[PDB]
Design a protein around this motif. Sequence first.
Motif, PDB file in Angstrom:
ATOM      1  N   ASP A  53      36.099  41.970  42.227  1.00 25.60           N
ATOM      2  CA  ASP A  53      37.583  41.889  42.961  1.00 25.60           C
ATOM      3  C   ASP A  53      37.544  40.605  43.678  1.00 25.60           C
ATOM      4  O   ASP A  53      36.617  39.738  44.078  1.00 25.60           O
ATOM      5  CB  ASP A  53      38.044  42.588  43.895  1.00 25.60           C
ATOM      6  CG  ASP A  53      37.041  42.949  44.609  1.00 25.60           C
ATOM      7  OD1 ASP A  53      35.750  42.088  44.681  1.00 25.60           O
ATOM      8  OD2 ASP A  53      36.763  44.277  45.321  1.00 25.60           O
ATOM      9  N   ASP A  56      31.007  42.671  44.153  1.00 27.38           N
ATOM     10  CA  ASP A  56      32.061  42.858  43.273  1.00 27.38           C
ATOM     11  C   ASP A  56      33.055  41.942  42.397  1.00 27.38           C
ATOM     12  O   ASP A  56      32.941  40.514  42.818  1.00 27.38           O
ATOM     13  CB  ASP A  56      33.209  43.694  44.158  1.00 27.38           C
ATOM     14  CG  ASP A  56      32.465  45.391  44.665  1.00 27.38           C
ATOM     15  OD1 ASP A  56      31.590  45.447  44.355  1.00 27.38           O
ATOM     16  OD2 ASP A  56      32.921  45.334  46.090  1.00 27.38           O
ATOM     17  N   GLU A  61      27.140  43.797  48.842  1.00 26.96           N
ATOM     18  CA  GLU A  61      28.285  43.540  49.562  1.00 26.96           C
ATOM     19  C   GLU A  61      28.253  44.566  50.812  1.00 26.96           C
ATOM     20  O   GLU A  61      29.028  44.189  51.931  1.00 26.96           O
ATOM     21  CB  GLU A  61      29.655  43.470  48.793  1.00 26.96           C
ATOM     22  CG  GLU A  61      30.875  42.944  49.839  1.00 26.96           C
ATOM     23  CD  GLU A  61      32.179  44.027  48.289  1.00 26.96           C
ATOM     24  OE1 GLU A  61      32.082  43.286  47.366  1.00 26.96           O
ATOM     25  OE2 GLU A  61      32.805  44.112  48.607  1.00 26.96           O
TER      26      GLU A  61
HETATM   27 MG    MG Z   1      35.839  46.463  47.075  1.00 26.45          MG
END
Ligand code: MG
Lengths: 779, 779
Positions: free
Chosen positions: A126, A124, A23
């Motif tokens: 999140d 991640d 990412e």
């Molecule tokens: Mg982040």
Amino acid sequence: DKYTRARNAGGKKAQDCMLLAAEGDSALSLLRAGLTLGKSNPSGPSFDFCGMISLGGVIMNACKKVTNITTDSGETIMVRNEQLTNNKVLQGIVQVLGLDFNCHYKTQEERAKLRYGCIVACVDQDLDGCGKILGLLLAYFHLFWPQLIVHGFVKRLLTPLIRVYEKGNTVPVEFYYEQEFDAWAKKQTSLANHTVKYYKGLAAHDTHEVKSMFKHFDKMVYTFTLDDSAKELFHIYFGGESELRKRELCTGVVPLTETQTQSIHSVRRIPCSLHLQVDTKAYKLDAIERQIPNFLDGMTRARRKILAGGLKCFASNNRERKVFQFGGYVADHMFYHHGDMSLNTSIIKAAQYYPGSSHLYPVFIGIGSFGSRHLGGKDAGSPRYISVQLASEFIKTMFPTEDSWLLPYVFEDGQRAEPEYYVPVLPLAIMEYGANPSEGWKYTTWARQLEDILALVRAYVDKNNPKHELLHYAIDHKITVLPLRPSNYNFKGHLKRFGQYYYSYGTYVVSEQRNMITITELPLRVPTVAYIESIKKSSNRMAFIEEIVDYSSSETIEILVKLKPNSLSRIMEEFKETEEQNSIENFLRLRNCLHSHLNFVKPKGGIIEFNSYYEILYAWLPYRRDLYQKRLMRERAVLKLRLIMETAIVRYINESADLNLSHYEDEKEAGRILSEHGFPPLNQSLITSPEFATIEELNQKALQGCYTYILSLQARELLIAAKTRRVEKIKKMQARLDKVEQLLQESPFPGASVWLEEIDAVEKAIIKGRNTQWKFHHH
Amino acid sequence: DKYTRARNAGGKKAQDCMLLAAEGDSALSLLRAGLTLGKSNPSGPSFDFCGMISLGGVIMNACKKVTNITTDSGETIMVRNEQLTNNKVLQGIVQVLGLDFNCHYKTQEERAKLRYGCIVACVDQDLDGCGKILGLLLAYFHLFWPQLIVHGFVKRLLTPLIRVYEKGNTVPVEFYYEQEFDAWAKKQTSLANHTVKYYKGLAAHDTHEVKSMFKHFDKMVYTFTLDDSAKELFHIYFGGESELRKRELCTGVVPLTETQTQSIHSVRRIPCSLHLQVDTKAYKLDAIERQIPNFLDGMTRARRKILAGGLKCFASNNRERKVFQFGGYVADHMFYHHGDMSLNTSIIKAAQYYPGSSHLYPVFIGIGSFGSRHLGGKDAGSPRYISVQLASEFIKTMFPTEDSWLLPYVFEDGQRAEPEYYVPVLPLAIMEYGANPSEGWKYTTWARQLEDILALVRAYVDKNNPKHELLHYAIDHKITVLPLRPSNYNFKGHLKRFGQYYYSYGTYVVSEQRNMITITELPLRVPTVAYIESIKKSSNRMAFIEEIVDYSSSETIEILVKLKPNSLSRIMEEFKETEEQNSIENFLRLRNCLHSHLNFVKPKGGIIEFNSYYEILYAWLPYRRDLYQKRLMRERAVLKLRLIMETAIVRYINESADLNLSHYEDEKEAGRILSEHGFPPLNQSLITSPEFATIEELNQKALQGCYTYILSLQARELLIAAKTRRVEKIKKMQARLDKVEQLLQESPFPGASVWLEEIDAVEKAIIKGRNTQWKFHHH
DNA sequence: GATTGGATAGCTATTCACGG
DNA sequence: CCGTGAAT
DNA sequence: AGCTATCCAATC
Ligand SMILES: [Mg+2]
Ligand SMILES: COc1cc(NS(C)(=O)=O)ccc1Nc1c2ccccc2nc2ccccc12
Ligand SMILES: COc1cc(NS(C)(=O)=O)ccc1Nc1c2ccccc2nc2ccccc12
Ligand SMILES: [Mg+2]
Ligand SMILES: [Mg+2]
């Protein structure tokens, strides 16, 4: 191009190598560290069979850029947009993998032509990483090569964000969603012997955890799979129709059943439809919550955090601080888990002030360069070299301090954060300018006239205004009896209403005796350089003009235009004149239309759509009235408790010598003696300065009392002047108490006079700020 | 290529157009705001005759990157190397100005060919911009085109540094140097009605201020002029001989006399020699001060600030923090006025730990990746994703907490900052590895053996060591009686002393069944990658080797040399085998020489040069001894005062019921009656927590006090248990007092046993850290 | 040329809607 | 095509 | 989130 090739990539062992897509850069570092663990474990991945590459933040959305056209033979081909072909990240991905936009990869021999066995996404846990980036990558692959997903070419690296450890046991229990974590926690009797660890991205999992995860590398790879429904899902969440997103995002997110997650974890195949239904929907709901303001407060979550942090920071002393330092303080204290550059940009935007700016009443005073009328305010300085400070004079009147203890609050990991929403004295939602998009909905607001708002609120609360009785409705609450016109504070132009739309016109003057046309006021909220560029791009208009230039200094604009000889006649000829707009305004684009998209976020989460500003005002009024009533009730309870405490204190002081407190041994003996003497036990810490605590909490905690308010008495208070000041204070509390008791029984609702006084104070503060260019004590 | 060309520049009005060279975008914005004035400042500069350019980099020192060669025609020509020719900033400047390196511009005809009439430098008033940038630019011009400086082609913009406003007046007064402002303020009777404002650079100024500056623009342009002396002066400050800088920088800067500055401000001309002698010399002295460690503390100014900030921050709790957040805290609390990236890099370097690193005893524990033996430690992670915390045990045992109250301190704007220097228990200057240059000097130190240092210090302090007597010198204190050898802690190689130089050797083994050469150790402080590249670079070495391989772990060295078959013979034949180093070591370059450049910074400013580590130790000892004595005396005085205060408090609490303080009216009556009863007036706040007061300050401020220590007593203290605890505390304080009195009389100097105990404690802490790889409670 | 530390700041692209 | 704020 | 060059000196 951060590609790190594999030794066997593209060779005879291509169909077993792996490509890792990161990412960002933290994922890149974690992957490199894990890969460089050779000679410590023969099993596990290494650079001879794995790739490494970075996606670079947000990737582009292909579903919107592409356009489908049918050919003569009925074939439907997808033409890719020019911007789509020029994206560096996608080009790098397609080059590294050697993908072709013509082969459908329906057979294994075609799949043998790729340079890697499969592509694994490392993101991640999140919302942004799992829902947006992974969702966009899946949408890209599904749009162009749907067959690749079917044969398991796309995989993801599933890492927990919650780990619960128990001392004495070397293995933890891992949770990938907060719901299962807190369900398990509440299931267990006590976790005091355990320890919880959150992982905000792949910037965690210390070398021990990295080694442990990379030991069982194959247990983390999950393969995506395709089903029939997912097709029509991919169009809803990434297609060109926002109506489908409006219909889909109007409800909540249904979590997965136990059977579904059990199958997923037992087989390690994830249906993409489930991923879209859960992670992408959650991200889109969060984006709506973040990018659209609340209709009571008028500010988004980031700006609310900024305001709360500013109040905390500048409460001690109002001294200027660098924007970087203040943003760091806010992120530290308000639990802001995002990039600091966005926070700094938000602070800079919140502190700006110029004609046509978004904020008519900014909550900050800026020292340095904070943009200008030209360039749209994008010419502001760097956060490292400009400073901000609190506009305390306006803040203490707009957001009353004593009302902050009564708002509902946002709790993170059991700690207090910025409140859920503020309740300003005047409705700030319809008092300023704003415009920005979000998922499904767009927000746009043009500010209203201050005088009209003041008249409306004074009519509602006055009980003596001649229009008070009719403003309150005994029939229905849709009728309009007072005007709400757009404000024209820093506007020298005109505002005219035609049909259902308000239009703003700039002002000019023409000197035909010289053949010179000068405009003196542009329409509302248009940058000067952008306006000049727009008037220069139109060749039809550009033909008549010889030259245009400006001498605007910093806040007043004038454009002078010298046009070709005998051009005015053609000006009226080509550009039609109508009552909506004359020939000159049409020629020079001096007319603007004010569109309003009154979409807000209600206090309990979600979206809400209004039809007029009157609806927003009528929705905002009850919250403020109820807040006033609750404030008064808690104030009365506090006064009663304080009066009891002070009377007891004075009684002890009167006969303190007789008691001879020094004679007794310790604290418990003294407390027992005091109770025998009739002194009531109270909660001194809860009465002198209680809490965010409520009234029933006040009574419950005052039920159980100590005698600390006597033992913590300094000798200096035992004198006579101290007792006299104490009894004078007691008289003052009694006067305040019966005054607020009288205020409680007031028409139409309790505390109307208090509201009137606050309105007057905030009006005076606004006037003073306007007089000094919103630089208090700096003129 | 930030450049906004003037309208008239190009060759028509080139003789009146001026070019403004700035530092950054802040100066660009200020100049743009000034120049954009129109119809409000008709007599002022504008883009008609004013250029605009940003340096966007740092200026190279051309005097070192050029070669002077005399051709056969008796002409000396200067040829510039590749780096000078390829510099972007110089290329941009010369292209914009259109300078020719063959034209000498000795007459007006050639000067008229330039694109601009003059170049004006607009830099900040700090040491950096005024000294370094301006000196480098002047050196460039003087080296290449002296006549341009002669004819006033180079000018500078002189902006005020400090301005003081008189309240009620719209005209302030300006000072360009801090000494001028200080002298004027001290001479000034009062300044309560005067408001001082510092201008750190020109990025911070009022709009009215810049309006005035551009109202009187020609009053702030000063032309540089050449003289006879400067011809050699430049060669001193920017030539290729460091000895001239050694001889020149060994003294302070002589300020300009009143007549010189009066003439400069009258005629607005600056001689370049004066600028070099003031601004450049001040900058170079500051660079020396901030780039070379103190011989007592062992650390530089930035590292001292970092250590003090860490001590202040991690005092409440040792919870880990991100590096960038900690750097922000340090910058905020100790007034670090430089970039944050430099501070983050310094913190990361201070927290590193690996074999051969610069810090054998880091003052930080690093959670994350902080580099390794390979790559020389440059493979650490980003400052946003690695955490640091205080090594509490080592710090507390090395820098005693009480001694911090007694060090001299550095004051910023009347506020405290990091200490002037620290005095550690053991001399940290010769127990670490260091190597870096600075203006006119180089610093290079190889760590000494811990055991020898311990033995030397103990023999100096023990007074019972059989070597104590001759360690002290009744003949002359310039003799050495104990060894001081380089430390080999993480070193498995060899150390051999030949003549006047120590050499470090790696360890190698040979196997004849293949002729495998195995390197098991490298000399001190050589990264593996650099060594591999060096051995590959030289042709005559690896021409006999096909391959080299290394499976080196994080802390072990092993190199296998796949060399040619039947090759040993000509390795012995070619690479000579001498007694200093064998043929094999000569062939793998496994021998290193330890050169030391022991140049340090004196406590009161300036530089000092040592000849051996014994001199450093001998210089360091008396400072520690005197600090111990001063600490003991201050603690004795504080103990006496506290004993008196507590005895008075006990007497009061004992007889309080007799006086019946309730009868008296106010504070003055209570104080009068207490004085009549004989209670002494003391300074409760000072005695309870002096924290900075000297021994004489305690005496001077003891008698002048109040009766606060009685009137601030709470009721809880009146009980029996509090009095019993107080009398126990009195007994303990008496025991500590006569213990300190015993410690005061102690040969050879007071507090020797305390020094011995602290030495033992720090040794135990060092051993514990070594056993856990400098990760306390993390193993 | 290379190398060490402590100092100089400004660029690199997108997503989401709905009107010009 | 552009342009807003809040995020990678 | 990362990426971009140079100054001082003395030995390699
Ligand atoms: Mg982040
Ligand atoms: C596409 O996003 C990025 C790409 C690159 N490099 S590339 C493949 O276009 O040659 C570099 C950075 C980004 N992402 C950016 C950011 C990511 C996280 C936080 C802040 C970012 N700010 C950016 C500003 C400008 C351009 C890209 C940014
Ligand atoms: C634009 O970048 C720079 C500008 C200046 N301007 S000035 C007049 O103060 O000399 C100076 C230097 C730079 N470049 C910098 C860097 C360049 C390459 C690699 C790292 C750099 N790091 C910097 C850090 C702070 C300031 C400038 C830097
Ligand atoms: Mg500067
Ligand atoms: Mg800076």
